[PDB]
Amino acid sequence: RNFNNLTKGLCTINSWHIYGKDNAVRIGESSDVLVTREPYVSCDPDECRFYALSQGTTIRGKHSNGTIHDRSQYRALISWPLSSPPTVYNSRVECIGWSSTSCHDGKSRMSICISGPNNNASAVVWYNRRPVAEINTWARNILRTQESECVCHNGVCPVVFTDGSATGPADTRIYYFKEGKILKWESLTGTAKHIEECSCYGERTGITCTCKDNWQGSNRPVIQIDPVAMTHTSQYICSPVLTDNPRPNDPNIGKCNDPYPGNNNNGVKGFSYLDGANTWLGRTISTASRSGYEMLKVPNALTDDRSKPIQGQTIVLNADWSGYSGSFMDYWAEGDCYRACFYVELIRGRPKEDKVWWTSNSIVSMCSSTEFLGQWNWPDGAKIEYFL
Amino acid sequence: RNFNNLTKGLCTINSWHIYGKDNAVRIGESSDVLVTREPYVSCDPDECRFYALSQGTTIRGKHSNGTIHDRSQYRALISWPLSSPPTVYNSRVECIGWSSTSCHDGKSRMSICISGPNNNASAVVWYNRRPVAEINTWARNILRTQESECVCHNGVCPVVFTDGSATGPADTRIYYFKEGKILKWESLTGTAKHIEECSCYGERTGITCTCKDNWQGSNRPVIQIDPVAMTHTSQYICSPVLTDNPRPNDPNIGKCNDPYPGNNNNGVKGFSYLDGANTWLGRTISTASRSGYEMLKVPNALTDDRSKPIQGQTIVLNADWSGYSGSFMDYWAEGDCYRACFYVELIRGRPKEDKVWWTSNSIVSMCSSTEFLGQWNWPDGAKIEYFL
Amino acid sequence: RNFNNLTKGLCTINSWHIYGKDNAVRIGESSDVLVTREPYVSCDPDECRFYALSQGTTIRGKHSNGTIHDRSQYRALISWPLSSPPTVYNSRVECIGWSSTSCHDGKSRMSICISGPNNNASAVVWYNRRPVAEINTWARNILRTQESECVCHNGVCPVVFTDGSATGPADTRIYYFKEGKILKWESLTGTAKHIEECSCYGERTGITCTCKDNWQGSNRPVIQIDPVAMTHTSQYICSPVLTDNPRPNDPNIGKCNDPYPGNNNNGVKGFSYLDGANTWLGRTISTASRSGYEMLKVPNALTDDRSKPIQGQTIVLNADWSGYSGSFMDYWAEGDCYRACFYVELIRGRPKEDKVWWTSNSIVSMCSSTEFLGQWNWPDGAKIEYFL
Amino acid sequence: RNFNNLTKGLCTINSWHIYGKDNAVRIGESSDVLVTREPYVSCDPDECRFYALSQGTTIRGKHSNGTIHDRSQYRALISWPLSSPPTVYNSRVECIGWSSTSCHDGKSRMSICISGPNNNASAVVWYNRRPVAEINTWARNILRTQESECVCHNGVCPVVFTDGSATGPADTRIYYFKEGKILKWESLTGTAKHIEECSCYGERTGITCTCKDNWQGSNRPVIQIDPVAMTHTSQYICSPVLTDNPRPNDPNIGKCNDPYPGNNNNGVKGFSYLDGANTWLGRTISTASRSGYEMLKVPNALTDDRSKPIQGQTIVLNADWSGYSGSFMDYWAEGDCYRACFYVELIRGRPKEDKVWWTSNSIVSMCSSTEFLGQWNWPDGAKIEYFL
Numbered sequence A, B, C, D: 001r002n003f004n005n006l007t008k009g010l011c012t013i014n015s016w017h018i019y020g021k022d023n024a025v026r027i028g029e030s031s032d033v034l035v036t037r038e039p040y041v042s043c044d045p046d047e048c049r050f051y052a053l054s055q056g057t058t059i060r061g062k063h064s065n066g067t068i069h070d071r072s073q074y075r076a077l078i079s080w081p082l083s084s085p086p087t088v089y090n091s092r093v094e095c096i097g098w099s100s101t102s103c104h105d106g107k108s109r110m111s112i113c114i115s116g117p118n119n120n121a122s123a124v125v126w127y128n129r130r131p132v133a134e135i136n137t138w139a140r141n142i143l144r145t146q147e148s149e150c151v152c153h154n155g156v157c158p159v160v161f162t163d164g165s166a167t168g169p170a171d172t173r174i175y176y177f178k179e180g181k182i183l184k185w186e187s188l189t190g191t192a193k194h195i196e197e198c199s200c201y202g203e204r205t206g207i208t209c210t211c212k213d214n215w216q217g218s219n220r221p222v223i224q225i226d227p228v229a230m231t232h233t234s235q236y237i238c239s240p241v242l243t244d245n246p247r248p249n250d251p252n253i254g255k256c257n258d259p260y261p262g263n264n265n266n267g268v269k270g271f272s273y274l275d276g277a278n279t280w281l282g283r284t285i286s287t288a289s290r291s292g293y294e295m296l297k298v299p300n301a302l303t304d305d306r307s308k309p310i311q312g313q314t315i316v317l318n319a320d321w322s323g324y325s326g327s328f329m330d331y332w333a334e335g336d337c338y339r340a341c342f343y344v345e346l347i348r349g350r351p352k353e354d355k356v357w358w359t360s361n362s363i364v365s366m367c368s369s370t371e372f373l374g375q376w377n378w379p380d381g382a383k384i385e386y387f388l
């Protein structure tokens, strides 16, 4: 085995096809399915798997009561087979904590979990299923990271962290790991003003991360990372097609170097694929809440502050709950291009559905097609009444 | 590993022996067994497994209510170990959708799932557990495929699709895949007038598919495919031993080139082994409904429009529910011949048993013997009253 | 991998140590544990596993009602990891039927299952998880075999079958298989007058099988098989230490060449290790029913019709239910000798405990020690009241 | 594969990071989780796993009633994947009994289980999943061993046993095994006056075991073993920082060569890392009961009878129940040093929580960091009321 190198460009994205769906909440109505949230997907050279933060209880279990809470000692990053649900019996624990990232470098997998109280959190970096390095909180205010997969090049895997205020200036760092060891870290530079929960992908041009501005922005900040020089830059998606949630209505001029205003102290993890005319943006359909999901083809969205959609695809109807979304790719697939993929978290339970006392989710996932495929919509599919 | 070649003829079929049975509904009365339908069986070089379309819920789960429905977003092709039941914890998801086929080419497995709304469905072709090619609906009317295994020769795996009316002329295509990539497709030729749900097997003479005519026919259409030239022909089984369901009584002259009339707009997936004097036909015992199952030795059934049974074997009593049936073989077994095999879907629940609100099934499977073995009958075995 | 050869003698048996115990009924009170009976143990070169005939239902499942019945279509030979219980999710189906044997030859495993109605049963011989040969009933009266492991030498694995009356003269055959193919079979010769459910083991002197006489005998018939010449002889254990159940009290003169009388038309599967002064016999403690279990050191028991115990060990108290017992050894263990092992079936439920409507069992297993170890007793451990 | 050699020293311990946590009782409220106690952790060259003594029943199972009892026939040493809970379906049985140890020597794993009545117990030594050697009770009074992992050097794995009184002088032996075979054993020498449940680790200086004095001592006895010479010495931890439970308050002068008095006929399994200025001691926070857990940096604690803490870390709040604790390390990790690790048993149920009728536990585990990481606390997390 050799370290994977990012030698390919993105495949042409003409539509999106169904990749995976686990129907976790449906199945969990009568099965030992773990309560989760903050899911994602990540590939090894020989297998792709679902990931999520467990809440250390099943949905039918009485301990599901209160799982709207974000940061307990009973949480852990788990992985399980593609499109299976996360069950007590098929879930592999990667590490313990309530914020995570994970990625394979071609030889072995790095996984990172953050745990601890708000003012005293720490990250533990696992490599090849062993703890290798540790990072203590530097701002004493909820040290947190991506909640989706990281990306590697020639053994080097960058990861974005944030420590500090959720509602003001914070201390964001980009760490560069190799075999779990810290090669270098640097403070955030560029014009992004607040950074959380970056969704990343790699291609021959480097590594691209689409994050969340939780402070003042409803446009998404972008961090572009050179994994060889181990340097980065940041800005926002220039496009007036805004992709945070909640968010204002789409203007006709976006912002490249500053937060687009209207919604403060909130946001949702999201993603994009920024690739010239091959650019696609994901967002919730609702501007008010985490419902619905759509992909929009927005040429040069990253750099064009006038750019508008020329094509689209509905993934989840606005009538259905969505949630977090993020990027991943199978870097070990055959062919001459990397096929763009993403997942959407379909949150069920609280706060929006409070007849139950739990909060969980299921997963739906799509990858790009060079065909122009017909579209469906993909609801979680569970009936809340069944849980009462 | 090399691509498998179809170098052997069928073993002499003198009777049928029990190969597998999962008792899924019995066990699912008190276990986390997934609701399924449209099952089949397919072999890898080192393992044979059961396959089926899950409904994304267990039988005891409250979401089992309404699983008579064919095409939800909660369906997926799953596989699980031979004669185990399809449980939440032992089922491997092959792809997402509500119509499927799957086969191993000697090196890796190709799986195909179709999903989407009726007027906008698409097929995704997986190879070695990765999505490789996609096919959009060409007639905008429930793009659908075999619901049993495909067959490969030297890397080339043909698959029969249909798009269009279930009750009139439709657009049937034969696709030729290699490592999941589309080599060629062609429109249906020959005298078959309607094609659905082909059951296929391969032998030195080529690949033989026995399908269903859902429009006007109660004799079964046959497609014969040359996987090297990548060409095909079609007709019907000439025999007056009719093997669709529902169906008229057996006449004394069959039809080779046209549907045998009497029953319109219905049918059941079925199969046959067409091999000169070594020919055996499968069918439900009832002419009215999906109950019972029998094998009949009908010499030259394919080409002889007068051919009658000279030997038989009951598989399922008429008193017991059956359903779909299809062909598979272990192409990687030892010996000088391919041993013919088949499965029978044993449907329980709706519409025939409507005291419950679900529809599911279990599997029974037989392979041929050169001995003349005593016969048993093989019911699903579950008591519906237990589910009330 | 090479075929295993029987090149060692038995280890000196000075006592018995605990080898395995699955506590299946205890655990099955609240878990998806399959109803079983007729268990045994058998080793691969890299793993030893528990085996049993499932009833195709869990204990808590409503279909457990009526599992006192011996021969349904819902039975199958299953295997599962050593001392785990047989669960829906961890059990591997070896073949379908209601009477079985199984053994590894050093390269691959042969498994045999018999299914069918009483007058039309057939055996299917699997090798390396594929069906290879089939045998039709020759006496049309419950074709049946060992219900414990077979033994192989240089690829040749003998198996004892019986077809015919349970209460009179029957047709017993010894089959010789290699890679699942039938090399030879022969009719029973020697002085044994009725043969069922042989328990076998192999050592440098050949293969020794201790069986059950269900007709007139309460001494156990013995079949000694030369796996190279593929020939055999038979007699009874000469010892007056009688080891069937039910049975008369121990006399002072046994019978070598005829059934020891007193109990007709009944018996229990059992075993022995016949090795000169290193001879140990297993039996139920009760003479009336399947309760208790003990090992007795009886020098030259096979050939000495006066032989008596000089040492012993209680395995199960008479107050506790037992059942079938049989022999197995790890032929792939290190060292200069084969360590004798056995299992005892601990039957719970009907007919003896009829407040429940099911019949199942758990397993306890011991292997020999060259030490003189202290003894314990090993009950099933489940409380029937919990199931009411 | 080669035998592992202890060629490294301990990593510098500046704090402790979360390594694993299974939340077994939380999950077991609604899942098939086995009742356990006496857990530990142990690594293979390619995997680290949780271990414990099962009680042969799930927590929700009715047979959980009475599991406060220590030594039934329904107990077994089981192992399961790191931070998964011990479920019926994912637990591997290592051997049968109610006292155990286990360790990998670099080539294969040795596991030892003791079973039997109080006056007639015996140990069975398994190697590479096969029984290899047996040891009969030598004092006829509850033969018992470590309840945490053993340690190997060049194939030689020492294990500490005790047979005899829990409340007076007993017969302690150190056994030296290789590939499960007994190389040598010796009676306890040195100044330790009573020995139970040793927690061991290995480093270039040899093998160090921290045990429990159940008779008169509240300081912990230490056994230091040379695995090459196969000899040992014993004393107590000299430090006045006392680490048994229950225990007196910390004095200012400890005892090196005798039990520190105040508490008789009780104790808890515990551990330490004794490494000059890099020394850390574990103990319950409460002096009265098994509640809370803390690590204390106590320079030269082993040899300095005046030594006091200069740094610490809370692991479990005093308000939360703890229990046994023990040492393990990943001897197959990369780097130039062995990273110290430990687990804490979090006991729930009886005797302290007697509204339920069971006794079980979950596991939390930490490894050392060279960083000075912020601390959290790690409760079991289950609510007893949910079980009523």
Ligand SMILES: *[C@@H]1O[C@H](CO)[C@@H](O[C@@H]2O[C@H](CO)[C@@H](O[C@@H]3O[C@H](CO[C@H]4O[C@H](CO[C@H]5O[C@H](CO)[C@@H](O)[C@H](O)[C@@H]5O)[C@@H](O)[C@H](O[C@H]5O[C@H](CO)[C@@H](O)[C@H](O)[C@@H]5O)[C@@H]4O)[C@@H](O)[C@H](O[C@H]4O[C@H](CO)[C@@H](O)[C@H](O)[C@@H]4O[C@H]4O[C@H](CO)[C@@H](O)[C@H](O)[C@@H]4O[C@H]4O[C@H](CO)[C@@H](O)[C@H](O)[C@@H]4O)[C@@H]3O)[C@H](O)[C@H]2NC(C)=O)[C@H](O)[C@H]1NC(C)=O
Pocket: A240, A241, A248, A249, A250, A285, A286, A287, A294, A295, A296, A308, A309, A310, A311, A312, A313, A372, A373, A374, A375, B119, B120
């Ligand atoms: C079977 O499946 C297939 C495959 O999926 C289905 O075909 C798909 O159908 C869907 C639905 O119609 C399409 O998605 C939409 O795409 C449009 C973009 O395409 C249109 O516009 C293009 C650009 O036109 C402009 O530029 C060109 C440049 O040359 C210029 O020529 C033109 O005059 C104009 O200036 C056109 O090129 C394009 O034409 C092409 O495609 C046609 C088919 O689509 C074809 O007929 C033509 O011949 C030609 O080939 C086409 O006209 C997206 O704009 C649209 O997304 C908007 O609308 C949805 C609601 O449907 C909304 O959710 C989106 O967010 C977005 O609307 C918001 O954002 C806008 C941008 O900021 C804003 O302006 C809007 O007002 C709106 O804003 C409001 O809502 C949001 C969300 O809540 C909120 O945040 C805001 O604040 C505000 O409140 C769809 O994505 C697929 O492209 C199409 N795919 C294919 C391959 O055809 C087929 O229908 C299915 N069949 C059946 C029977 O069902």
Ligand SMILES: *[C@@H]1O[C@H](CO)[C@@H](O[C@@H]2O[C@H](CO)[C@@H](O[C@@H]3O[C@H](CO[C@H]4O[C@H](CO[C@H]5O[C@H](CO)[C@@H](O)[C@H](O)[C@@H]5O)[C@@H](O)[C@H](O[C@H]5O[C@H](CO)[C@@H](O)[C@H](O)[C@@H]5O)[C@@H]4O)[C@@H](O)[C@H](O[C@H]4O[C@H](CO)[C@@H](O)[C@H](O)[C@@H]4O[C@H]4O[C@H](CO)[C@@H](O)[C@H](O)[C@@H]4O[C@H]4O[C@H](CO)[C@@H](O)[C@H](O)[C@@H]4O)[C@@H]3O)[C@H](O)[C@H]2NC(C)=O)[C@H](O)[C@H]1NC(C)=O
Pocket: B240, B241, B248, B249, B250, B285, B286, B287, B294, B295, B296, B308, B309, B310, B311, B312, B313, B372, B373, B374, B375, C119, C120
């Ligand atoms: C232990 O197990 C063994 C092994 O399984 C059991 O032995 C088996 O027993 C079964 C049951 O009897 C047999 O299955 C039947 O086979 C017959 C065919 O065999 C008969 O016919 C042969 C052909 O005869 C013709 O041609 C020859 C050519 O030379 C000529 O000589 C002859 O005069 C005649 O012209 C004979 O060769 C054959 O004889 C041989 O076998 C005998 C044993 O079977 C033996 O005794 C002889 O010595 C000789 O060796 C034999 O006579 C099938 O025809 C039959 O299938 C029909 O019947 C079942 C109902 O049982 C039905 O479900 C089938 O669908 C079919 O009937 C329908 O289709 C016909 C064709 O269209 C139609 O004509 C019928 O009217 C009927 O149609 C109606 O029903 C269908 C279904 O609902 C509906 O769709 C229609 O519209 C309409 O309503 C059986 O398959 C096995 O072959 C046999 N196996 C062996 C190895 O022996 C044994 O019994 C068990 N033991 C015990 C104690 O239980």
Ligand SMILES: *[C@@H]1O[C@H](CO)[C@@H](O[C@@H]2O[C@H](CO)[C@@H](O[C@@H]3O[C@H](CO[C@H]4O[C@H](CO[C@H]5O[C@H](CO)[C@@H](O)[C@H](O)[C@@H]5O)[C@@H](O)[C@H](O[C@H]5O[C@H](CO)[C@@H](O)[C@H](O)[C@@H]5O)[C@@H]4O)[C@@H](O)[C@H](O[C@H]4O[C@H](CO)[C@@H](O)[C@H](O)[C@@H]4O[C@H]4O[C@H](CO)[C@@H](O)[C@H](O)[C@@H]4O[C@H]4O[C@H](CO)[C@@H](O)[C@H](O)[C@@H]4O)[C@@H]3O)[C@H](O)[C@H]2NC(C)=O)[C@H](O)[C@H]1NC(C)=O
Pocket: C240, C241, C248, C249, C250, C285, C286, C287, C294, C295, C296, C308, C309, C310, C311, C312, C313, C372, C373, C374, C375, D119, D120
């Ligand atoms: C800790 O654990 C250890 C290790 O397990 C325990 O030690 C074990 O203790 C058990 C229980 O006592 C022993 O099992 C019994 O063994 C005897 C055989 O040993 C005795 O007999 C030997 C033979 O004596 C004869 O021959 C010699 C030849 O030289 C001659 O010298 C002698 O005079 C006589 O002629 C003796 O050699 C032997 O002495 C040796 O061992 C002694 C310790 O055992 C030691 O003290 C001596 O110094 C010497 O070293 C000893 O005297 C078995 O006979 C016995 O089995 C019978 O009894 C049980 C009931 O307990 C019964 O279930 C059996 O079926 C059997 O009884 C039936 O069968 C007989 C034969 O047909 C029949 O005659 C009986 O009437 C009876 O029949 C009735 O019941 C059956 C069953 O229902 C029914 O079918 C019939 O029809 C009828 O109704 C036990 O197996 C272990 O051997 C022993 N192991 C060791 C290593 O010591 C220790 O006790 C534990 N410690 C504590 C504190 O618990």
Ligand SMILES: *[C@@H]1O[C@H](CO)[C@@H](O[C@@H]2O[C@H](CO)[C@@H](O[C@@H]3O[C@H](CO[C@H]4O[C@H](CO[C@H]5O[C@H](CO)[C@@H](O)[C@H](O)[C@@H]5O)[C@@H](O)[C@H](O[C@H]5O[C@H](CO)[C@@H](O)[C@H](O)[C@@H]5O)[C@@H]4O)[C@@H](O)[C@H](O[C@H]4O[C@H](CO)[C@@H](O)[C@H](O)[C@@H]4O[C@H]4O[C@H](CO)[C@@H](O)[C@H](O)[C@@H]4O[C@H]4O[C@H](CO)[C@@H](O)[C@H](O)[C@@H]4O)[C@@H]3O)[C@H](O)[C@H]2NC(C)=O)[C@H](O)[C@H]1NC(C)=O
Pocket: A119, A120, D240, D241, D248, D249, D250, D285, D286, D287, D294, D295, D296, D308, D309, D310, D311, D312, D313, D372, D373, D374, D375
């Ligand atoms: C974010 O996380 C970080 C990282 O975890 C947190 O920082 C940690 O904070 C904890 C809690 O404070 C610390 O644990 C305690 O450590 C002390 C030891 O450190 C103190 O003492 C050192 C030694 O001082 C002596 O020697 C030096 C030698 O030169 C001499 O200079 C000095 O004058 C004195 O003679 C000092 O060196 C040390 O200073 C250093 O550290 C300071 C920060 O801690 C820093 O500010 C300084 O600048 C300097 O760098 C410091 O003063 C342990 O003693 C203590 O353990 C005792 O207390 C706990 C209760 O908290 C108790 O459970 C323990 O068992 C123990 O107390 C018992 O045992 C004693 C010994 O026998 C006995 O004397 C006591 O009376 C007591 O006995 C009673 O209770 C027990 C238990 O029930 C019973 O058995 C007895 O019988 C009796 O009833 C803690 O372990 C960490 O060290 C610290 N880590 C780091 C890296 O800083 C941070 O707080 C978090 N942030 C937030 C916002 O929460």
Ligand SMILES: COCCNC(=O)O[C@@H]([C@@H]1OC(C(=O)O)=C[C@H](NC(=N)N)[C@H]1NC(C)=O)[C@H](O)CO
Pocket: B038, B053, B070, B071, B098, B099, B142, B143, B144, B147, B166, B196, B214, B267, B268
């Ligand atoms: C008016 O009818 C239009 C919709 N009906 C339809 O398509 O039914 C078809 C199949 O029928 C059955 C069956 O049991 O009869 C089960 C399959 N279910 C699957 N999920 N695969 C069906 N195939 C599909 C793609 O749904 C039938 O062959 C007619 O075309």
Ligand SMILES: COCCNC(=O)O[C@@H]([C@@H]1OC(C(=O)O)=C[C@H](NC(=N)N)[C@H]1NC(C)=O)[C@H](O)CO
Pocket: D038, D053, D070, D071, D098, D099, D142, D143, D144, D147, D166, D196, D214, D267, D268
């Ligand atoms: C009068 O007492 C005689 C019986 N008590 C006894 O043996 O308790 C011992 C251990 O205690 C505890 C505990 O939690 O304190 C849990 C262990 N349980 C296991 N199943 N291993 C016990 N070990 C055994 C072999 O039972 C103790 O160390 C005294 O010797």
Ligand SMILES: [Ca+2]
Pocket: A212, A213, A214, A215, A216, A217, A218, A244, A245, A263, A264, A265, A266, A267, A268
């Ligand atoms: Ca925002």
Ligand SMILES: [Ca+2]
Pocket: B212, B213, B214, B215, B216, B217, B218, B244, B245, B263, B264, B265, B266, B267, B268
């Ligand atoms: Ca039809």
Ligand SMILES: [Ca+2]
Pocket: C212, C213, C214, C215, C216, C217, C218, C244, C245, C263, C264, C265, C266, C267, C268
């Ligand atoms: Ca008898």
Ligand SMILES: [Ca+2]
Pocket: D212, D213, D214, D215, D216, D217, D218, D244, D245, D263, D264, D265, D266, D267, D268
């Ligand atoms: Ca003590």
